Structure formats: structure tokens, C-alpha cells
């Protein structure tokens, strides 16, 4: 259960460039259906235009995941489309974003315990296009389990996990009405932050919040979060003592003063130690059948013939959950950490993740190199080599 926010009340009177990966869900085999993914990350502002292209032409039915953001405030989103790869068809992803002067086109290259309850809140103004878009997204660990999205005629909280369907109507009604009240606070804060930052009246701006708690197996609060950002930059945050505020900016000092006088840190500490812990306990219980499950990576090495007497070995980890993983290459028992190439871990689109790490090695020396895969789901680390 998310907190009821208090207005920031800053008083009366920033671009990040997207990173893009294009890759298939399953290893491509010509003639057999697959999914092509376009994973776009690390961008701010959240407005973005993603097209997928086949032989230079816009692909019609392209699915878009809901947009999320990470702890560094940057947004991410997965686009995908059904496709059957052929030997000669070219695919690409084209991304248009205010950080870039021209659209970016990225071509598909066949060589491709404690628990936490956190709410990720986004409010984005859209002047001349409608009311601000407001979203509340709840996660137990990294599992999204509830979502409120204002961009609907009769918006309301919806379960994003089957185990939340147990909750009765009184729960959904309470959460929905609280979200609609929260939406109003952020609408007002968006208006007043314009003046506090001496900004023009016609641009889109964003408020982001991370709010929640991390709780140990003994049921004691390990960490509480109440962090705000404006236009992708830190604004104010509750300190680990749950008593004082860090204001990252001159504008936020006005909020800090008001919240001190109003005792907002004590209201937060009570929510965190009370409602937040109790809700997490409740959600962990109903989600017990699925929330603790892990999927171990399946790994294999591919071989790619490079210029002259060098080859690339690529160590793949597929189908794993959660996303945290480590891949290393070894020669003679030493880790080649500085000569590897890696990709950022990326969703397959079915709930599991992919990653690979490659090293360039002398032709004929491939058997001297070992890839190592470290994941919490494995009994012990995987060790593998290239096999013709």
C-alpha cells in the first residue's frame, strides 16, 4: 500500500541519451517464428518514439511494454514484434528522442533473505495535450504486482500478478481513491515547480518518486525510501535515519523547511515501520508460490571468425531470473576483465533475462579459454568452453 503523498510545496511565484539493443527472443533460425526485441534504456525525458523496420520499412504491429524507470531515474521500455528471420532480410530499430538531433537507427546483428516493497511514481506534464500523466507502480522485489495509470477514462489500480487477485474489492477501491488523490498533489506540484525553477510555461516536466521499505527476515526495517526527482535530477530524499532530509537543490530547501515544520519525516517513519512492513508481509504471503522462485541460466559458447588470425568467443547466459548475473572469461586461471566485451543484461520479453560476454582470442587457441557464469540460482558456478 503506497503512502498518501504530501505536496512538495516548493513555493509560490536534464537530457539523457537512449541506449538501444536489438535482439531476438530465441536464437534465430531462418523460417521459424521468433520475436524481435528493441530494448531502450537510460533515457530522459520519458517521451520517445520507437519504430521497428524490415528492409527499411516501418513494421506495422509493434508491441510496447509499459514504461518503467530505474533507481538512477532514467526510463526504459521494451518494444517487440513477431518475425520470421530469413537469410537476407534486414531488421532495425529506429528511436527518436529529444536528446538526439536525428533519429538513431540500430540494426539487428545476428551476433546480438530480505525483501522489499517499493512504489515507483511518475507524473509527466503534457501542456497543450491534456492533463499530466500519472502512474503508480508497485514492486515486491523486482516483481511488478500493481499499477495505477491515469491515462484512462475511469482509472484504477490493477493487479499485475495473479496472486494479487486474491485481494477483495475494498482493497482496490481504497488504493484507487488514494492514487487519484495523490495524482492531484503531483498536478499542483508540477505547476509550482515551473516557477521555482524559473521555467517556461509550455514544456513537459517530470516528477519521480521511489517510496517503500526493505525488511529483513526478522521483520525489522532495514531501509526506508522516500526519494524525489524533478526532471530526472535529485530533488529531496529521506535520510537513512528516517529523521532528516537531504535537499539536493536550492529549490528543495523550501520543501525541507516546510516538511520539518510539518513533521513529515515522522509521518514517513510511521508509514514505513507500520503500513509498509505489514503490506509487504501480506504481499509476500499471497505471492509465496512464485515470488521466491529463481531460474538458473542456460549457457553456451558461440564462435565468430574475425579478421586474420583472431576469433571471437561469445559466452551466452539465457533464460535466467532474477536479472543479476556475472559472466567472466578466464585464461590460465586469470580473469580477462579488461579485454571482454559485454552487453547490458536485457529482458527476453517472457520474464527471463539474457546476457553475453565475449573475448577475442588467437585462432587455434579457443580451448585455452573458459567462460564462468555466476548466478544465485546455480548450485555452483557454471564453467564452459567452446565446443566445435
Residue numbers in the entry: 1 to 13, 24 to 122, 143 to 418
Recite the paper's sentences.
MHC Is are heterotrimers consisting of a transmembrane heavy chain (HC), β2-microglobulin (β2m), and a peptide antigen, typically of 8–11 amino acids in length. Major histocompatibility complex class I (MHC I)3 molecules present a diverse array of antigenic peptides, the so-called immunopeptidome, to circulating cytotoxic T lymphocytes. Here, endoplasmic reticulum aminopeptidase 1 (ERAP1) and ERAP2 trim peptides to the optimal length for stable MHC I binding in the final editing step of the antigen processing pathway.
Based on an examination of the native structure of the SIINFEKL (SL8)/Kb pMHC I complex, and the structure of the single-chain SL8-β2m-Kb HC trimer, we introduced alanine substitutions at residues 63, 66, and 167 in the MHC I HC which interact with the bound peptide in the A-pocket. Positions Glu63 and Lys66 interact directly with S(P1) and I(P2) of SL8, whereas Trp167 caps off the N terminus amino group of the peptide. For the W167A-SCT variant the structure and H-bonding network around S(P1) and I(P2) remain very similar to WT-SCT, whereas the space created by the missing Trp167 indole ring is filled by three water molecules. Interestingly, the side chain of N(P4) adopted similar orientation in K66A-SCT, whereas two alternative rotamer states of the N(P4) side chain were resolved in W167A-SCT. Expression of WT (*002) ERAP1 (25) in SCT transfected HeLa E1KO resulted in a significant decrease in the levels of all A-pocket variants detected by 25-D1.16 (∼35–40%). The peptide in both E63A- and K66A-SCT displayed low RMSDCα values (<1.0 Å), whereas SL8 in W167A-SCT deviated more from the initial position, with RMSDCα of ∼2.0 Å. Remarkably, SL8 in W167A-Kb deviated significantly during the simulation and displayed RMSDCα of 6.8 ± 1.1 Å. Examination of the MD trajectory of the untethered W167A pMHC I revealed that the N terminus of SL8 became detached from the A-pocket within 10 ns after equilibration of the system. Partial dissociation of the N-terminal portion of the peptide was observed, however complete dissociation did not occur at this timescale even when the anchor residue F(P5), initially buried inside the binding groove, turned toward the solvent-exposed face of the groove, indicating the strong and preferential binding of the peptide C terminus. In particular, E63A-SCT exhibited the lowest free energy profile, followed by W167A-SCT, both of which displayed the lowest energy barriers at the midpoints of the dissociation path.
